[PDB]
C-alpha cells in the first residue's frame, strides 16, 4: 500500500520507502502538450492544465465551463462511439486535428471509469515492412536481439539503444546494444532489483510505452488538482504526458541523459524485457514515429517466443541417442539401483555433472564425486522440506547456509523427486568454478547505502564464490522428461509387490491352520496315555490278582493303540515341516 | 511425392491424385505484373515473363542479356546488402521506383537465384484497430472485431475468420458481409477442400491472392532454369499463378477475387482470413502491407484470449477442485474414497457414468453399460498408447461398441501410472445432433471429378455423438491424473513394510515347525521305550518290579506326565503368537 501524494499530504520519498510511492498519481504533466478531463456523458470540461490556454489559443475563463460539442464538431460523436462506458482503460483513440492557431495537433483520448482524458501534441518509405521480415528470418536469439537494436536506432536517431532483459530473480542485464561512435559500452553489465521497483513492473505490463523529453524540466500541474466527481486525485495511468517520478529524474541526470524512451516486451502476461533509449541532449520524438515503435514492441513479443523455443529444440538434438537408451531402460527397470548406477548409460554425461546421488528403497548409493557421508544425510533432509517436484540452483551457498563449506564438491544442484514427498530422488552436483561478474556502477549491496542515486556507472568487478556452471534450459526440460518416466514406471513396480504380499498371506494361512489343529489333536492322545497311567496306578496298588491281570497284555494291547497314535503323529509332524 | 508438371510431362489432375500436385512450380504468373530472374553474383537476366517487354517499356532482345547494374543504378548495391547468400527464402525486400509511372518492386532469394516482381503503385486506421483487439473480452468477441476492421480497409464483399479443427476440417466462426447476400456462418467444410501440401506451404508463406478467376496464365521464357536445368521454384512469389483445380472451385461459388492471410500459432496453422469479391478486383500493394500486420497481431492475440477462456471456466469449479485434489493425495484406499458420493466425481466433468479400476476390481457408479461389454471396453483402452484418451464419438474409433450408444457415447479416460493397469473413465449419454454442412458432406466430395456446384445449407443427421468436451475440463482432468500418479509413491512405501512383516511371520513358522517336530520325537520314543519296560516285567518276580519301585516307575512316567504338561502350555502360546 502506497503513501498519499505530496499535494494532499505525504512523506518525502527516499531509498527506504521506494516500494510505496504514488507513481500513477503525480497531478502534473510534462510541458510539451496540454491536458483536459471531461464528463463521460455531458462532455463538460472539469480539469485543465495551466498551459492549455496558450497551447490551444483561447482565454481560460472561456474553456472552463464548455462542452466538447463546441470544441470538436466532427470528433465528439465519433469519440463516443469508439469508447463506450465500462471498457478497459488500456484502450486508446487517436485523431489528427486542424487547429488554426497551433497549426496541427494530434489528439489522444482514453476513459478511466467515468472520466475522459484528453492529450494534445504538435504534429506534421518501406522501413517497417523490411524490418518485419528481418526479424522473422533471424537464426538465433542473440542474432534477433542484434537486428532489433540496429533498426530502432536507424528510425529514431537516438544515441544509445539497448535490449534489456530480466532474470527470473528480477535483476537486469543488457544483452544487445548499438551506439554512436566515441561512447561508452553498457553491454553485459548486470543491474540490481532496486533500480526498477515492483509497482513499476506492475504498471509496465499494462501500459507499454512511456518517455521523458527533458530531465531538467519543471512539472506543470493541474487546476483544479482534485477530481470534481469523486473528490480524489485524478488517475494518469494511461497518460502519455504522465510526469516522471522525481526519484528517477535524478538518476538520469547523474548518468548524463537528456531524453529517455522505453517499450515493454511482454511474453505470456509477464514482463520479459525493455527497449531502453538514451539521448545526451533534450529531444522530442514526433507522435507518428512513436506508433512505428509500438509495432516493433508487439512484433518482438511474438518473435522472442519462437527463437527461445528453437534454441532448446536444437540443443535437444545433440543429446538424442543419449536420451533414447536412458528412457528405454528406466521404464522397464524393477531394480532402480542396479540399472541407473551402471556406467554404460553414463548418467553424469547427460547433465554434464560431477556427482550423482541415487536414492531408492532406503539406501543412498553414490557415483562420481560426492561430499563426505554425514553431510549427504544433512542435504537429503533439506530436500524433504522443499515443496516442489524439481529443485534448480546454481548457488547452494545462499539457499542452504549450513552446506556453504561443501563448495569444492558441490556448488550447483539439480534435483528430481520421483513420486512425492522426496522419498525417492535423483541429485546432480557440479563443482565450484571461479566467477567474475561485471556490474554496471555498483553491486546490489551498495544500492541501499546512498539516500539518492549513485554517481558512478563504470565497470565494477566483484569476486563471487560458491557458483558453478549455470544450467542450460534444455537440460531442465530433459530432466523433467526423465522424472515422468520414473514416476510412470512406478505403476508396474507396485503391481508386483502386491502379488508377493498375496503369496505371504497364503503361507500365514498354513501356519495358523496347522498350528491350531495339530496342537488340539495332540491334547487328546496325551490325555489318553495319562488316563491310562491312571490304570497303571489302579492295578499294582492292590498287589492282588485283578480280573485284568490275565489281560494285562490286552491292556498293553490298548496302549498299543496309543503307541500307534504317536507313531502316526511323528510321521505327520515330519511331513508338515517339509511342506 | 508429387507428380512432374504439365509442361515437362505429367498426368492431368483429378480428385484421386490431388495430394500429389506441383503447386509451387506452375511456370506461369497472373497478368498484373512482370517477373525477372537473375544470378546471385553477376546480376545477368536469366528468365523473363512474356509481358515484361510491355510492362517496363523496352525491346525483349535488349533486356535478355543485360546486367541489373544497368536497370537499377541505386537499388542494385543496396539489394545485395540486404540479401546475402545462404539466407531463408522467406526473407523479402521491397522498394518503390520511378519508372518513366510508378512501380513497386519485390525481391527474394531462392538459393542461387534472385526473383523480381513488379506491380503498379501510387490516417490512424491501423493504430486504432490494434488497441481494439487488445481490449476484446473473449475469443468470439475478438473474432468479430477482426472481420469488421478488415472489410472496412479492403472494401471486400465478404470477410470471414476460418478456423481448423484438430482433425483438419474447417468451420467459419465470424463473418461480416454486404447487405443482401448469403450467410456462410457456422457452416463446416471437409478436409478435401484444403490439401495437405497447401497446409504445408501456408505455414511458411502467409499471404496469397487471385485477382481474376477467368484469367489466362502468362508463362515464362525460358521455361526451365539455365543453371540447374529444372523448373523455377515460385514458393515466395506473390504473382504465383493459382492451381487450375482451385480456380474452377471459385467459379462455381461465384467469386472473382480471392485473398487469404494465414494465422500461425506456435508453428501450426490455426486458421485463415478469407475474402471474396464477386467482380474482378485488384488490391494495391501498400494496402496488402496493412493486412500483413493484422496477420501477425492476431496470431499473438489468439493465444491470449484462448488462455483467458480456460482460466475463467476453471474459476467456477474452484471449490469442487480443491477438495477432490486434497482427498485423492492422502488416500491409500482408492476405491473407498473416490466412489464416495460426497465428492461427486460425476459433476466435476458433467458426465453420466464413472468407472473406477484399482487393484483388479471395476466398481461402478452412475449410468454404466452391461457388465460383459465393460470388460470389452477396458481391453480396448490397454491397446491405446497414450496417457489420456479423448473422444466425443466412440462409434467411429471402436466399431464393436457402436451398440452401446444410449449408455456411453462420449468418453474421457485417464491412466494413472502406465499401461492402463489402473484408470478412470467418464461416459456421456447419446444426444440428438444436426450439423449444417456448407454445400456437401465429406462423403459426397469424392464423387464428382471436379468441384461441387451447390453451396447451400445441407442438413445431416449424425448418431453416436454426445456433448463435446470443454477444453477446460481436459486441463482439469490432467491435473487429477498427476495427483493420483504422485500419491502412488506413498502407496508403495507402505506395502513394502507389510511385506517385511510377513517374512517375520514366515521365519516363525519354519523355526517352530522344525524344532517342536524333532523335540516331539524324543518324548514319543521315551514312551515307546517305556513300553519296552511294560513288556520286560509282566510279573512281579522280575528284577525290575518291586512294590516300592513301581511308584518310582510311576515316578519315571511322572517325568512323562510333566512332558505333556509343558507341551500343552507351549501349544496354546504358539497358537496365540
Ligand atoms: C542503464 C540501465 C538502466 C537501468 C538499470 C534503468 C532502470 C529503470 N528504472 C526505471 C523506472 C523507475 N525507477 C525508479 C526508482 C529508482 N531508480 C533507481 O535506480 C533508484 C534511485 C530508484 C529507487 C530506489 C522509479 C520511481 C521509476 C519509475 C519512474 C516513472 O516512470 O515515474 C526504468 C523505466 C524508466 C525509463 O523508461 O527510463 C528503468 C528501465 N534505467 C536504465 O536505463
Ligand atoms: C467457403 C469456404 C472456403 C473453402 C472450403 C475453401 C477452401 C480452400 N481451398 C484452398 C486451397 C486449395 N484447394 C485446392 C484443391 C481443391 N479444392 C477443392 O475444394 C477440391 C476440388 C480440391 C482438391 C481435391 C488447391 C490445389 C488449393 C491450393 C491453391 C493454390 O495455392 O494454388 C484454399 C486457399 C485458397 C484461397 O485463398 O481461396 C481454401 C481456403 N475456400 C473457401 O473460401
PDB file of N, CA and C and ligand atoms in Angstrom, chain A residues 14-15 18 21 23 162 164 186 191 194-197 200 204 210 242-245 247-248 251-252 255 260-262 274 276 278 452-454, ligand 1:
ATOM      1  N   UNK A  14      12.408   8.412  -0.072  1.00  0.00           N
ATOM      2  CA  UNK A  14      13.814   8.043  -0.001  1.00  0.00           C
ATOM      3  C   UNK A  14      13.979   6.595  -0.466  1.00  0.00           C
ATOM      4  N   UNK A  15      15.152   6.013  -0.179  1.00  0.00           N
ATOM      5  CA  UNK A  15      15.507   4.665  -0.605  1.00  0.00           C
ATOM      6  C   UNK A  15      14.800   3.611   0.249  1.00  0.00           C
ATOM      7  N   UNK A  18      10.588   3.312  -1.182  1.00  0.00           N
ATOM      8  CA  UNK A  18      10.503   3.469  -2.626  1.00  0.00           C
ATOM      9  C   UNK A  18       9.420   2.552  -3.189  1.00  0.00           C
ATOM     10  N   UNK A  21       5.151   4.290  -3.289  1.00  0.00           N
ATOM     11  CA  UNK A  21       5.223   5.616  -3.886  1.00  0.00           C
ATOM     12  C   UNK A  21       4.056   5.818  -4.850  1.00  0.00           C
ATOM     13  N   UNK A  23       3.131   6.759  -7.984  1.00  0.00           N
ATOM     14  CA  UNK A  23       3.719   6.984  -9.296  1.00  0.00           C
ATOM     15  C   UNK A  23       2.639   7.433 -10.277  1.00  0.00           C
ATOM     16  N   UNK A 162      19.368  -0.196 -26.493  1.00  0.00           N
ATOM     17  CA  UNK A 162      19.785  -1.452 -25.888  1.00  0.00           C
ATOM     18  C   UNK A 162      18.586  -2.287 -25.446  1.00  0.00           C
ATOM     19  N   UNK A 164      17.140  -4.772 -23.052  1.00  0.00           N
ATOM     20  CA  UNK A 164      17.299  -5.056 -21.640  1.00  0.00           C
ATOM     21  C   UNK A 164      16.456  -6.284 -21.307  1.00  0.00           C
ATOM     22  N   UNK A 186      27.748  -0.330 -22.564  1.00  0.00           N
ATOM     23  CA  UNK A 186      26.999  -0.787 -21.403  1.00  0.00           C
ATOM     24  C   UNK A 186      26.695  -2.280 -21.504  1.00  0.00           C
ATOM     25  N   UNK A 191      22.536  -5.314 -13.486  1.00  0.00           N
ATOM     26  CA  UNK A 191      21.977  -4.210 -12.719  1.00  0.00           C
ATOM     27  C   UNK A 191      21.028  -4.745 -11.643  1.00  0.00           C
ATOM     28  N   UNK A 194      16.751  -3.119  -7.351  1.00  0.00           N
ATOM     29  CA  UNK A 194      16.380  -1.903  -6.644  1.00  0.00           C
ATOM     30  C   UNK A 194      16.079  -0.758  -7.613  1.00  0.00           C
ATOM     31  N   UNK A 195      16.672  -0.815  -8.817  1.00  0.00           N
ATOM     32  CA  UNK A 195      16.582   0.249  -9.808  1.00  0.00           C
ATOM     33  C   UNK A 195      15.179   0.313 -10.412  1.00  0.00           C
ATOM     34  N   UNK A 196      14.570  -0.862 -10.616  1.00  0.00           N
ATOM     35  CA  UNK A 196      13.202  -0.977 -11.097  1.00  0.00           C
ATOM     36  C   UNK A 196      12.345  -1.498  -9.942  1.00  0.00           C
ATOM     37  N   UNK A 197      11.587  -0.620  -9.238  1.00  0.00           N
ATOM     38  CA  UNK A 197      10.638  -1.059  -8.209  1.00  0.00           C
ATOM     39  C   UNK A 197       9.501  -1.936  -8.738  1.00  0.00           C
ATOM     40  N   UNK A 200       6.232  -0.438 -10.576  1.00  0.00           N
ATOM     41  CA  UNK A 200       6.538  -0.022 -11.936  1.00  0.00           C
ATOM     42  C   UNK A 200       6.483  -1.225 -12.875  1.00  0.00           C
ATOM     43  N   UNK A 204       4.017  -1.588 -16.100  1.00  0.00           N
ATOM     44  CA  UNK A 204       4.599  -1.723 -17.430  1.00  0.00           C
ATOM     45  C   UNK A 204       4.099  -2.978 -18.145  1.00  0.00           C
ATOM     46  N   UNK A 210       6.360   4.670 -22.506  1.00  0.00           N
ATOM     47  CA  UNK A 210       6.497   5.946 -21.815  1.00  0.00           C
ATOM     48  C   UNK A 210       7.848   6.567 -22.170  1.00  0.00           C
ATOM     49  N   UNK A 242       2.137  11.736 -18.665  1.00  0.00           N
ATOM     50  CA  UNK A 242       2.326  11.467 -17.248  1.00  0.00           C
ATOM     51  C   UNK A 242       3.746  11.876 -16.861  1.00  0.00           C
ATOM     52  N   UNK A 243       3.842  12.808 -15.902  1.00  0.00           N
ATOM     53  CA  UNK A 243       5.111  13.351 -15.440  1.00  0.00           C
ATOM     54  C   UNK A 243       5.878  12.287 -14.657  1.00  0.00           C
ATOM     55  N   UNK A 244       7.188  12.209 -14.926  1.00  0.00           N
ATOM     56  CA  UNK A 244       8.055  11.162 -14.406  1.00  0.00           C
ATOM     57  C   UNK A 244       8.335  11.420 -12.928  1.00  0.00           C
ATOM     58  N   UNK A 245       8.532  10.327 -12.179  1.00  0.00           N
ATOM     59  CA  UNK A 245       8.776  10.353 -10.745  1.00  0.00           C
ATOM     60  C   UNK A 245      10.067  11.111 -10.430  1.00  0.00           C
ATOM     61  N   UNK A 247      12.256  10.865  -8.186  1.00  0.00           N
ATOM     62  CA  UNK A 247      13.304   9.917  -7.843  1.00  0.00           C
ATOM     63  C   UNK A 247      14.125   9.591  -9.093  1.00  0.00           C
ATOM     64  N   UNK A 248      13.437   9.094 -10.132  1.00  0.00           N
ATOM     65  CA  UNK A 248      14.049   8.535 -11.328  1.00  0.00           C
ATOM     66  C   UNK A 248      14.663   9.636 -12.193  1.00  0.00           C
ATOM     67  N   UNK A 251      18.250  10.155 -11.340  1.00  0.00           N
ATOM     68  CA  UNK A 251      19.058   9.005 -11.720  1.00  0.00           C
ATOM     69  C   UNK A 251      19.653   9.193 -13.114  1.00  0.00           C
ATOM     70  N   UNK A 252      18.891   9.845 -14.000  1.00  0.00           N
ATOM     71  CA  UNK A 252      19.283  10.025 -15.390  1.00  0.00           C
ATOM     72  C   UNK A 252      20.199  11.238 -15.540  1.00  0.00           C
ATOM     73  N   UNK A 255      23.689  10.022 -14.794  1.00  0.00           N
ATOM     74  CA  UNK A 255      24.097   9.173 -15.903  1.00  0.00           C
ATOM     75  C   UNK A 255      24.571  10.040 -17.071  1.00  0.00           C
ATOM     76  N   UNK A 260      14.780  10.035 -22.377  1.00  0.00           N
ATOM     77  CA  UNK A 260      14.538   8.617 -22.154  1.00  0.00           C
ATOM     78  C   UNK A 260      13.320   8.172 -22.966  1.00  0.00           C
ATOM     79  N   UNK A 261      13.318   6.891 -23.371  1.00  0.00           N
ATOM     80  CA  UNK A 261      12.190   6.230 -24.017  1.00  0.00           C
ATOM     81  C   UNK A 261      12.343   4.721 -23.854  1.00  0.00           C
ATOM     82  N   UNK A 262      11.253   4.048 -23.461  1.00  0.00           N
ATOM     83  CA  UNK A 262      11.260   2.600 -23.299  1.00  0.00           C
ATOM     84  C   UNK A 262       9.967   1.962 -23.807  1.00  0.00           C
ATOM     85  N   UNK A 274      12.848  -4.850 -21.848  1.00  0.00           N
ATOM     86  CA  UNK A 274      12.606  -3.469 -22.237  1.00  0.00           C
ATOM     87  C   UNK A 274      13.517  -3.099 -23.407  1.00  0.00           C
ATOM     88  N   UNK A 276      15.300   0.150 -24.096  1.00  0.00           N
ATOM     89  CA  UNK A 276      15.604   1.427 -23.469  1.00  0.00           C
ATOM     90  C   UNK A 276      16.484   2.280 -24.381  1.00  0.00           C
ATOM     91  N   UNK A 278      18.513   6.251 -24.814  1.00  0.00           N
ATOM     92  CA  UNK A 278      19.091   7.418 -24.171  1.00  0.00           C
ATOM     93  C   UNK A 278      19.539   8.424 -25.223  1.00  0.00           C
ATOM     94  N   UNK A 452      20.051   8.940  -2.338  1.00  0.00           N
ATOM     95  CA  UNK A 452      19.549   9.090  -3.695  1.00  0.00           C
ATOM     96  C   UNK A 452      20.235   8.129  -4.665  1.00  0.00           C
ATOM     97  N   UNK A 453      20.347   8.483  -5.969  1.00  0.00           N
ATOM     98  CA  UNK A 453      21.036   7.634  -6.945  1.00  0.00           C
ATOM     99  C   UNK A 453      22.559   7.725  -6.854  1.00  0.00           C
ATOM    100  N   UNK A 454      23.232   6.684  -7.362  1.00  0.00           N
ATOM    101  CA  UNK A 454      24.686   6.586  -7.377  1.00  0.00           C
ATOM    102  C   UNK A 454      25.253   7.440  -8.510  1.00  0.00           C
TER     103      UNK A 454
HETATM  104  C1  LIG C   1      21.367   1.577 -17.653  1.00  0.00           C
HETATM  105  C2  LIG C   1      20.300   0.857 -17.444  1.00  0.00           C
HETATM  106  C3  LIG C   1      19.128   1.327 -16.843  1.00  0.00           C
HETATM  107  C4  LIG C   1      18.524   0.906 -15.617  1.00  0.00           C
HETATM  108  C5  LIG C   1      19.097  -0.106 -14.666  1.00  0.00           C
HETATM  109  C6  LIG C   1      17.279   1.621 -15.514  1.00  0.00           C
HETATM  110  C7  LIG C   1      16.254   1.314 -14.678  1.00  0.00           C
HETATM  111  C8  LIG C   1      14.968   1.744 -14.768  1.00  0.00           C
HETATM  112  N1  LIG C   1      14.227   2.288 -13.752  1.00  0.00           N
HETATM  113  C9  LIG C   1      13.007   2.682 -14.239  1.00  0.00           C
HETATM  114  C10 LIG C   1      11.980   3.219 -13.521  1.00  0.00           C
HETATM  115  C11 LIG C   1      11.935   3.751 -12.233  1.00  0.00           C
HETATM  116  N2  LIG C   1      12.906   3.611 -11.275  1.00  0.00           N
HETATM  117  C12 LIG C   1      12.540   4.257 -10.124  1.00  0.00           C
HETATM  118  C13 LIG C   1      13.294   4.301  -8.973  1.00  0.00           C
HETATM  119  C14 LIG C   1      14.637   4.201  -8.785  1.00  0.00           C
HETATM  120  N3  LIG C   1      15.613   4.197  -9.773  1.00  0.00           N
HETATM  121  C15 LIG C   1      16.826   3.873  -9.269  1.00  0.00           C
HETATM  122  O1  LIG C   1      17.766   3.420  -9.893  1.00  0.00           O
HETATM  123  C16 LIG C   1      16.775   4.168  -7.771  1.00  0.00           C
HETATM  124  C17 LIG C   1      17.371   5.540  -7.437  1.00  0.00           C
HETATM  125  C18 LIG C   1      15.282   4.065  -7.549  1.00  0.00           C
HETATM  126  C19 LIG C   1      14.658   3.854  -6.386  1.00  0.00           C
HETATM  127  C20 LIG C   1      15.256   3.435  -5.081  1.00  0.00           C
HETATM  128  C21 LIG C   1      11.255   4.846 -10.359  1.00  0.00           C
HETATM  129  C22 LIG C   1      10.479   5.647  -9.361  1.00  0.00           C
HETATM  130  C23 LIG C   1      10.884   4.541 -11.649  1.00  0.00           C
HETATM  131  C24 LIG C   1       9.609   4.937 -12.344  1.00  0.00           C
HETATM  132  C25 LIG C   1       9.658   6.329 -12.964  1.00  0.00           C
HETATM  133  C26 LIG C   1       8.348   6.773 -13.591  1.00  0.00           C
HETATM  134  O2  LIG C   1       8.007   6.258 -14.675  1.00  0.00           O
HETATM  135  O3  LIG C   1       7.673   7.636 -12.995  1.00  0.00           O
HETATM  136  C27 LIG C   1      13.018   2.435 -15.650  1.00  0.00           C
HETATM  137  C28 LIG C   1      11.967   2.895 -16.625  1.00  0.00           C
HETATM  138  C29 LIG C   1      12.042   4.383 -16.991  1.00  0.00           C
HETATM  139  C30 LIG C   1      12.651   4.673 -18.354  1.00  0.00           C
HETATM  140  O4  LIG C   1      11.970   4.389 -19.380  1.00  0.00           O
HETATM  141  O5  LIG C   1      13.802   5.198 -18.386  1.00  0.00           O
HETATM  142  C31 LIG C   1      14.123   1.690 -15.923  1.00  0.00           C
HETATM  143  C32 LIG C   1      14.377   0.966 -17.215  1.00  0.00           C
HETATM  144  N4  LIG C   1      17.317   2.677 -16.413  1.00  0.00           N
HETATM  145  C33 LIG C   1      18.248   2.392 -17.383  1.00  0.00           C
HETATM  146  O6  LIG C   1      18.318   2.935 -18.474  1.00  0.00           O
END
